[model samples]
Target: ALNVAGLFNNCVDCFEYVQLGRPFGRDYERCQLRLDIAKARLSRWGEAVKINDDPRFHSDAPTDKSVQLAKSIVEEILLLFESAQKTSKRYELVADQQDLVVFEDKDMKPIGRALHRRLNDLVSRRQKQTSLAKKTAWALYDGKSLEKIVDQVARFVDELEKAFPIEAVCHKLAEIEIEEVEDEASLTILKDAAGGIDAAMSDAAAQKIDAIVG
Candidate 1:
Protein backbone atom coordinates (compact mmCIF):
# COMPACT_ATOMS: atom_id res chain seq x y z
CA ALA A 1 0.00 0.00 0.00
CA LEU A 2 1.35 3.37 -1.01
CA ASN A 3 -0.21 5.21 1.89
CA VAL A 4 0.44 8.90 2.38
CA ALA A 5 0.38 8.52 6.16
CA GLY A 6 2.93 5.73 5.88
CA LEU A 7 5.15 7.91 3.69
CA PHE A 8 4.65 10.89 5.98
CA ASN A 9 5.71 8.79 8.95
CA ASN A 10 8.85 7.79 7.09
CA CYS A 11 9.54 11.47 6.49
CA VAL A 12 9.18 12.06 10.23
CA ASP A 13 11.52 9.17 10.95
CA CYS A 14 14.09 10.65 8.60
CA PHE A 15 13.89 13.91 10.56
CA GLU A 16 14.69 12.04 13.77
CA TYR A 17 18.08 11.19 12.28
CA VAL A 18 18.79 14.49 10.55
CA GLN A 19 21.94 15.77 12.20
CA LEU A 20 22.61 19.20 13.62
CA GLY A 21 26.38 19.03 13.42
CA ARG A 22 28.37 20.42 16.29
CA PRO A 23 28.37 24.18 15.86
CA PHE A 24 32.11 24.55 15.30
CA GLY A 25 32.04 28.30 14.56
CA ARG A 26 29.52 31.10 14.14
CA ASP A 27 29.19 30.42 10.42
CA TYR A 28 28.74 26.71 11.03
CA GLU A 29 26.38 27.46 13.91
CA ARG A 30 24.15 29.60 11.72
CA CYS A 31 24.11 26.92 9.04
CA GLN A 32 23.16 24.28 11.59
CA LEU A 33 20.49 26.58 13.01
CA ARG A 34 18.99 27.10 9.57
CA LEU A 35 18.97 23.34 9.02
CA ASP A 36 17.20 22.92 12.35
CA ILE A 37 14.55 25.43 11.34
CA ALA A 38 14.14 23.77 7.96
CA LYS A 39 13.57 20.40 9.63
CA ALA A 40 11.04 21.99 11.95
CA ARG A 41 9.16 23.50 9.04
CA LEU A 42 8.71 20.07 7.43
CA SER A 43 7.51 18.59 10.73
CA ARG A 44 5.13 21.48 11.19
CA TRP A 45 3.70 20.78 7.74
CA GLY A 46 3.03 17.15 8.68
CA GLU A 47 1.32 18.31 11.85
CA ALA A 48 -0.63 20.82 9.81
CA VAL A 49 -1.89 18.14 7.40
CA LYS A 50 -2.70 15.69 10.20
CA ILE A 51 -2.06 12.82 7.78
CA ASN A 52 -1.89 10.38 10.65
CA ASP A 53 -5.54 10.98 11.50
CA ASP A 54 -6.92 11.59 8.04
CA PRO A 55 -8.79 8.64 6.51
CA ARG A 56 -8.24 9.88 2.97
CA PHE A 57 -4.51 9.33 3.32
CA HIS A 58 -4.81 5.87 4.90
CA SER A 59 -5.91 4.00 1.77
CA ASP A 60 -3.56 1.99 -0.44
CA ALA A 61 -4.14 4.17 -3.47
CA PRO A 62 -5.56 7.61 -2.90
CA THR A 63 -8.12 8.59 -5.53
CA ASP A 64 -7.93 12.27 -4.83
CA LYS A 65 -5.45 14.17 -6.97
CA SER A 66 -4.09 16.17 -4.06
CA VAL A 67 -3.52 13.05 -1.99
CA GLN A 68 -1.60 11.52 -4.85
CA LEU A 69 0.44 14.67 -5.19
CA ALA A 70 1.15 14.62 -1.48
CA LYS A 71 2.37 11.02 -1.63
CA SER A 72 4.92 11.73 -4.34
CA ILE A 73 5.99 14.97 -2.69
CA VAL A 74 6.59 13.20 0.61
CA GLU A 75 8.48 10.44 -1.19
CA GLU A 76 10.86 12.99 -2.66
CA ILE A 77 11.22 14.70 0.71
CA LEU A 78 12.27 11.37 2.18
CA LEU A 79 14.83 10.92 -0.58
CA LEU A 80 16.24 14.37 0.16
CA PHE A 81 16.96 13.35 3.76
CA GLU A 82 18.42 10.04 2.65
CA SER A 83 20.67 11.82 0.17
CA ALA A 84 21.73 14.36 2.78
CA GLN A 85 22.68 11.55 5.16
CA LYS A 86 24.90 10.00 2.50
CA THR A 87 26.48 13.35 1.64
CA SER A 88 27.27 14.06 5.30
CA LYS A 89 28.83 10.64 5.70
CA ARG A 90 31.10 11.31 2.74
CA TYR A 91 32.29 14.56 4.37
CA GLU A 92 32.85 12.77 7.69
CA LEU A 93 35.63 10.76 6.02
CA VAL A 94 37.91 13.82 6.04
CA ALA A 95 36.63 15.72 9.08
CA ASP A 96 39.23 16.47 11.76
CA GLN A 97 37.98 16.75 15.34
CA GLN A 98 40.90 18.82 16.67
CA ASP A 99 40.53 21.52 14.02
CA LEU A 100 36.76 21.89 14.61
CA VAL A 101 35.67 25.14 16.34
CA VAL A 102 33.30 24.70 19.26
CA PHE A 103 30.00 26.54 19.24
CA GLU A 104 28.47 27.95 22.45
CA ASP A 105 25.13 29.47 23.42
CA LYS A 106 26.85 32.70 24.36
CA ASP A 107 27.87 33.06 20.73
CA MET A 108 24.26 33.71 19.67
CA LYS A 109 22.96 37.23 19.17
CA PRO A 110 19.52 38.32 20.45
CA ILE A 111 17.95 37.61 17.05
CA GLY A 112 19.45 34.12 16.96
CA ARG A 113 18.03 33.44 20.42
CA ALA A 114 14.54 34.40 19.24
CA LEU A 115 14.91 32.10 16.23
CA HIS A 116 16.10 29.33 18.52
CA ARG A 117 13.03 29.78 20.70
CA ARG A 118 10.79 29.32 17.67
CA LEU A 119 12.69 26.20 16.63
CA ASN A 120 12.34 24.79 20.13
CA ASP A 121 8.62 25.46 20.15
CA LEU A 122 8.13 23.75 16.79
CA VAL A 123 10.11 20.69 17.86
CA SER A 124 8.20 20.46 21.14
CA ARG A 125 4.92 20.06 19.28
CA ARG A 126 6.04 16.84 17.59
CA GLN A 127 4.17 13.71 18.73
CA LYS A 128 5.75 10.94 20.78
CA GLN A 129 4.92 8.32 18.15
CA THR A 130 7.55 9.89 15.93
CA SER A 131 10.31 9.33 18.49
CA LEU A 132 13.27 7.03 17.83
CA ALA A 133 14.77 4.85 20.54
CA LYS A 134 18.41 5.13 19.42
CA LYS A 135 19.46 8.22 17.48
CA THR A 136 22.37 8.58 15.09
CA ALA A 137 24.73 11.57 15.09
CA TRP A 138 25.13 12.59 11.44
CA ALA A 139 26.10 16.22 11.13
CA LEU A 140 26.18 18.22 7.89
CA TYR A 141 29.82 19.22 7.28
CA ASP A 142 29.34 22.50 5.42
CA GLY A 143 26.94 25.23 4.33
CA LYS A 144 26.63 23.95 0.74
CA SER A 145 25.19 20.60 1.78
CA LEU A 146 23.02 22.21 4.42
CA GLU A 147 21.67 24.72 1.92
CA LYS A 148 20.89 22.02 -0.64
CA ILE A 149 18.83 19.99 1.81
CA VAL A 150 17.10 23.00 3.37
CA ASP A 151 16.13 24.54 0.05
CA GLN A 152 14.82 21.29 -1.43
CA VAL A 153 12.83 20.45 1.71
CA ALA A 154 11.37 23.94 1.72
CA ARG A 155 10.45 23.65 -1.97
CA PHE A 156 8.71 20.32 -1.44
CA VAL A 157 6.93 21.67 1.62
CA ASP A 158 5.67 24.65 -0.35
CA GLU A 159 4.35 22.25 -2.96
CA LEU A 160 2.63 20.25 -0.24
CA GLU A 161 1.07 23.45 1.05
CA LYS A 162 -0.18 24.21 -2.44
CA ALA A 163 -1.58 20.72 -2.87
CA PHE A 164 -3.61 21.06 0.28
CA PRO A 165 -4.34 24.76 0.41
CA ILE A 166 -7.52 24.34 2.44
CA GLU A 167 -5.99 22.03 4.98
CA ALA A 168 -2.92 24.27 5.09
CA VAL A 169 -5.18 27.16 6.13
CA CYS A 170 -6.12 25.26 9.26
CA HIS A 171 -2.53 25.70 10.27
CA LYS A 172 -2.14 29.16 8.79
CA LEU A 173 -4.49 30.86 11.26
CA ALA A 174 -2.42 29.66 14.19
CA GLU A 175 0.77 30.39 12.30
CA ILE A 176 -0.38 34.00 11.86
CA GLU A 177 -0.87 34.43 15.60
CA ILE A 178 2.47 32.76 16.25
CA GLU A 179 4.13 35.01 13.69
CA GLU A 180 2.59 38.07 15.33
CA VAL A 181 4.20 37.17 18.64
CA GLU A 182 7.42 36.39 16.81
CA ASP A 183 7.24 39.75 15.07
CA GLU A 184 7.00 41.51 18.43
CA ALA A 185 9.90 39.46 19.72
CA SER A 186 11.75 40.20 16.50
CA LEU A 187 11.10 43.93 16.97
CA THR A 188 12.72 43.73 20.38
CA ILE A 189 15.61 41.76 18.98
CA LEU A 190 15.95 44.20 16.10
CA LYS A 191 15.86 47.13 18.48
CA ASP A 192 18.60 45.54 20.51
CA ALA A 193 20.54 44.65 17.40
CA ALA A 194 20.06 48.05 15.77
CA GLY A 195 20.21 50.09 18.98
CA GLY A 196 17.17 52.06 17.88
CA ILE A 197 13.62 51.09 16.84
CA ASP A 198 13.20 54.23 14.76
CA ALA A 199 16.19 53.47 12.58
CA ALA A 200 15.13 49.88 12.19
CA MET A 201 11.56 50.78 11.23
CA SER A 202 12.72 53.34 8.68
CA ASP A 203 15.09 50.94 7.06
CA ALA A 204 12.57 48.14 7.15
CA ALA A 205 9.86 50.34 5.65
CA ALA A 206 12.19 51.49 2.91
CA GLN A 207 13.08 47.94 2.05
CA LYS A 208 9.42 46.88 2.05
CA ILE A 209 8.54 49.76 -0.28
CA ASP A 210 11.44 48.96 -2.51
CA ALA A 211 10.37 45.30 -2.69
CA ILE A 212 6.81 46.33 -3.54
CA VAL A 213 7.68 48.98 -6.12
CA GLY A 214 10.51 47.11 -7.72
Candidate 2:
Protein backbone atom coordinates (compact mmCIF):
# COMPACT_ATOMS: atom_id res chain seq x y z
CA ALA A 1 0.00 0.00 0.00
CA LEU A 2 1.49 3.31 -1.12
CA ASN A 3 -0.12 5.60 1.44
CA VAL A 4 0.88 9.23 1.09
CA ALA A 5 0.45 10.01 4.77
CA GLY A 6 2.57 7.02 5.75
CA LEU A 7 5.31 8.02 3.32
CA PHE A 8 5.19 11.58 4.59
CA ASN A 9 5.36 10.33 8.14
CA ASN A 10 8.44 8.29 7.31
CA CYS A 11 10.12 11.40 5.96
CA VAL A 12 9.54 13.17 9.25
CA ASP A 13 10.68 10.11 11.19
CA CYS A 14 14.10 10.22 9.53
CA PHE A 15 15.23 13.02 11.82
CA GLU A 16 14.46 11.32 15.11
CA TYR A 17 17.66 9.38 15.70
CA VAL A 18 20.12 11.64 13.88
CA GLN A 19 23.27 12.10 15.98
CA LEU A 20 24.98 15.42 15.27
CA GLY A 21 28.52 14.41 16.46
CA ARG A 22 30.43 15.48 19.62
CA PRO A 23 32.71 18.40 20.66
CA PHE A 24 30.44 20.72 18.73
CA GLY A 25 31.89 24.03 17.60
CA ARG A 26 30.24 27.00 15.87
CA ASP A 27 30.10 25.27 12.50
CA TYR A 28 28.81 22.07 14.09
CA GLU A 29 26.05 23.85 16.00
CA ARG A 30 25.00 25.71 12.90
CA CYS A 31 24.76 22.42 11.03
CA GLN A 32 22.69 20.96 13.87
CA LEU A 33 20.33 23.92 13.88
CA ARG A 34 20.11 23.83 10.11
CA LEU A 35 18.96 20.21 10.24
CA ASP A 36 16.46 20.96 12.99
CA ILE A 37 15.00 23.76 10.91
CA ALA A 38 14.90 21.51 7.85
CA LYS A 39 12.96 18.84 9.75
CA ALA A 40 10.48 21.40 11.03
CA ARG A 41 10.06 22.79 7.53
CA LEU A 42 9.23 19.36 6.12
CA SER A 43 6.73 18.75 8.90
CA ARG A 44 5.18 22.14 8.21
CA TRP A 45 4.71 21.16 4.57
CA GLY A 46 2.85 17.97 5.54
CA GLU A 47 0.65 19.92 7.95
CA ALA A 48 -0.09 22.65 5.42
CA VAL A 49 -1.31 20.06 2.94
CA LYS A 50 -3.37 18.36 5.68
CA ILE A 51 -2.06 15.02 4.58
CA ASN A 52 -2.94 13.18 7.77
CA ASP A 53 -6.57 14.22 7.82
CA ASP A 54 -7.22 14.22 4.09
CA PRO A 55 -8.90 11.09 2.77
CA ARG A 56 -7.27 11.36 -0.64
CA PHE A 57 -3.83 10.97 0.89
CA HIS A 58 -4.92 8.25 3.31
CA SER A 59 -5.82 5.88 0.48
CA ASP A 60 -3.48 2.99 -0.40
CA ALA A 61 -3.16 4.16 -4.01
CA PRO A 62 -4.44 7.66 -4.55
CA THR A 63 -5.93 8.24 -8.02
CA ASP A 64 -5.29 11.96 -7.93
CA LYS A 65 -2.33 12.86 -10.13
CA SER A 66 -1.03 15.48 -7.72
CA VAL A 67 -1.25 13.08 -4.83
CA GLN A 68 0.67 10.52 -6.89
CA LEU A 69 3.35 13.07 -7.61
CA ALA A 70 3.59 14.08 -3.98
CA LYS A 71 4.00 10.45 -2.98
CA SER A 72 6.93 9.94 -5.33
CA ILE A 73 8.63 13.14 -4.22
CA VAL A 74 8.26 12.18 -0.60
CA GLU A 75 9.79 8.78 -1.37
CA GLU A 76 12.84 10.37 -3.01
CA ILE A 77 13.20 12.76 -0.08
CA LEU A 78 13.25 9.79 2.25
CA LEU A 79 15.99 8.20 0.17
CA LEU A 80 18.06 11.38 0.45
CA PHE A 81 17.95 11.15 4.21
CA GLU A 82 18.70 7.43 4.18
CA SER A 83 21.67 7.83 1.85
CA ALA A 84 23.10 10.66 3.94
CA GLN A 85 22.76 8.51 7.04
CA LYS A 86 24.78 5.76 5.39
CA THR A 87 27.44 8.21 4.22
CA SER A 88 27.74 9.75 7.67
CA LYS A 89 28.27 6.37 9.27
CA ARG A 90 31.12 5.72 6.86
CA TYR A 91 32.67 9.13 7.64
CA GLU A 92 32.43 8.55 11.38
CA LEU A 93 34.66 5.52 11.15
CA VAL A 94 37.56 7.50 9.66
CA ALA A 95 37.48 10.54 11.98
CA ASP A 96 40.15 10.18 14.69
CA GLN A 97 40.42 13.45 16.66
CA GLN A 98 37.83 15.15 18.85
CA ASP A 99 37.30 18.90 18.63
CA LEU A 100 38.67 20.91 21.59
CA VAL A 101 35.90 23.51 21.42
CA VAL A 102 32.88 22.86 23.61
CA PHE A 103 29.36 23.54 22.44
CA GLU A 104 27.65 26.67 23.79
CA ASP A 105 23.89 26.80 24.29
CA LYS A 106 23.79 30.45 23.30
CA ASP A 107 25.21 29.65 19.84
CA MET A 108 21.92 28.35 18.47
CA LYS A 109 19.43 29.59 21.08
CA PRO A 110 18.01 32.62 19.27
CA ILE A 111 17.04 30.83 16.07
CA GLY A 112 16.24 27.60 17.87
CA ARG A 113 13.86 29.26 20.29
CA ALA A 114 11.97 31.03 17.54
CA LEU A 115 11.58 27.80 15.57
CA HIS A 116 10.37 25.94 18.65
CA ARG A 117 7.65 28.49 19.36
CA ARG A 118 6.37 28.41 15.79
CA LEU A 119 6.65 24.80 14.63
CA ASN A 120 7.62 22.60 17.55
CA ASP A 121 4.09 21.45 18.22
CA LEU A 122 3.42 20.70 14.58
CA VAL A 123 6.64 18.68 14.32
CA SER A 124 6.13 16.78 17.56
CA ARG A 125 2.50 15.87 16.80
CA ARG A 126 3.48 14.08 13.61
CA GLN A 127 6.50 12.57 15.33
CA LYS A 128 4.34 11.10 18.10
CA GLN A 129 1.81 9.59 15.72
CA THR A 130 4.27 7.96 13.33
CA SER A 131 7.36 7.47 15.46
CA LEU A 132 9.41 4.44 14.52
CA ALA A 133 12.29 3.75 16.86
CA LYS A 134 15.33 2.72 14.91
CA LYS A 135 18.24 0.95 16.64
CA THR A 136 21.00 2.73 14.74
CA ALA A 137 21.59 6.46 14.86
CA TRP A 138 22.48 8.48 11.74
CA ALA A 139 25.75 10.18 12.63
CA LEU A 140 26.57 13.39 10.74
CA TYR A 141 30.35 13.85 10.86
CA ASP A 142 30.97 16.89 8.68
CA GLY A 143 29.43 20.11 7.43
CA LYS A 144 29.55 18.98 3.79
CA SER A 145 27.19 16.06 4.37
CA LEU A 146 24.84 18.20 6.42
CA GLU A 147 24.79 20.85 3.72
CA LYS A 148 23.92 18.31 1.05
CA ILE A 149 21.10 16.87 3.18
CA VAL A 150 19.61 20.28 3.89
CA ASP A 151 19.92 21.37 0.27
CA GLN A 152 18.18 18.25 -1.03
CA VAL A 153 15.41 18.57 1.54
CA ALA A 154 14.78 22.15 0.47
CA ARG A 155 14.77 21.16 -3.21
CA PHE A 156 12.25 18.37 -2.63
CA VAL A 157 10.06 20.62 -0.53
CA ASP A 158 10.07 23.05 -3.45
CA GLU A 159 9.01 20.21 -5.73
CA LEU A 160 6.18 19.34 -3.37
CA GLU A 161 4.89 22.90 -3.66
CA LYS A 162 4.98 22.62 -7.45
CA ALA A 163 3.01 19.38 -7.35
CA PHE A 164 0.36 20.87 -5.08
CA PRO A 165 0.61 24.61 -5.44
CA ILE A 166 -0.58 26.40 -2.30
CA GLU A 167 0.17 30.09 -2.29
CA ALA A 168 -0.82 30.75 1.31
CA VAL A 169 1.09 27.76 2.57
CA CYS A 170 4.19 28.80 0.72
CA HIS A 171 3.94 32.28 2.18
CA LYS A 172 3.42 30.90 5.66
CA LEU A 173 6.35 28.51 5.48
CA ALA A 174 8.63 31.22 4.17
CA GLU A 175 7.94 33.09 7.38
CA ILE A 176 10.24 30.70 9.22
CA GLU A 177 13.22 33.01 9.31
CA ILE A 178 16.41 33.32 11.32
CA GLU A 179 17.73 36.59 12.70
CA GLU A 180 19.70 38.50 10.07
CA VAL A 181 23.14 38.03 11.63
CA GLU A 182 22.77 34.31 12.20
CA ASP A 183 21.02 33.88 8.88
CA GLU A 184 23.89 35.42 6.96
CA ALA A 185 26.51 33.56 8.96
CA SER A 186 24.84 30.21 8.45
CA LEU A 187 24.23 30.90 4.78
CA THR A 188 27.93 31.65 4.33
CA ILE A 189 28.88 28.41 6.04
CA LEU A 190 26.45 26.41 3.92
CA LYS A 191 27.72 28.04 0.75
CA ASP A 192 31.33 27.36 1.61
CA ALA A 193 30.61 23.75 2.50
CA ALA A 194 28.77 23.23 -0.77
CA GLY A 195 31.61 24.78 -2.74
CA GLY A 196 34.19 22.72 -0.87
CA ILE A 197 32.40 19.49 -1.75
CA ASP A 198 32.07 20.37 -5.43
CA ALA A 199 35.71 21.37 -5.73
CA ALA A 200 36.85 18.20 -3.99
CA MET A 201 34.77 16.05 -6.32
CA SER A 202 36.12 17.84 -9.41
CA ASP A 203 39.71 17.46 -8.24
CA ALA A 204 39.22 13.78 -7.55
CA ALA A 205 37.75 13.17 -11.02
CA ALA A 206 40.48 15.18 -12.74
CA GLN A 207 43.22 13.25 -10.88
CA LYS A 208 41.57 9.95 -11.80
CA ILE A 209 41.48 10.91 -15.51
CA ASP A 210 45.11 12.05 -15.47
CA ALA A 211 46.20 8.80 -13.88
CA ILE A 212 44.22 6.75 -16.41
CA VAL A 213 45.70 8.68 -19.35
CA GLY A 214 49.24 8.15 -18.06
* Candidate with best lDDT: 2
lDDT against true structure, model 1: 0.60
What C-alpha lDDT, on a 0 to 100 scale, does residue 58 get in candidate 2?
Answer: 85
Clashes of 1: 1
Model 2 segments more than 4 A misplaced = 97-119, 126-135, 173-214
Q: Which stretches of candidate 1 lie over 4 Å from their true place?
A: 20-24, 99-114, 126-135, 167-214
lDDT by residue for model 1 (75-103), tens: 89877777887887776677777433434
TM-score of each: 0.68, 0.68
Q: What's the lDDT of the predicted structure labeled candidate 2?
A: 0.62
- Candidate 2 per-residue C-alpha lDDT over 1-214 given as tens digits, one digit per residue, 9 for 90 to 100: 4578888887788776676666344565556656666776677678778887889998878899999888888889878877887786676667665732234334555644443333345578655353343435556766677778888887777677677767466455433322222343333443343232222222333433344455
RMSD of each: 7.1, 11.7
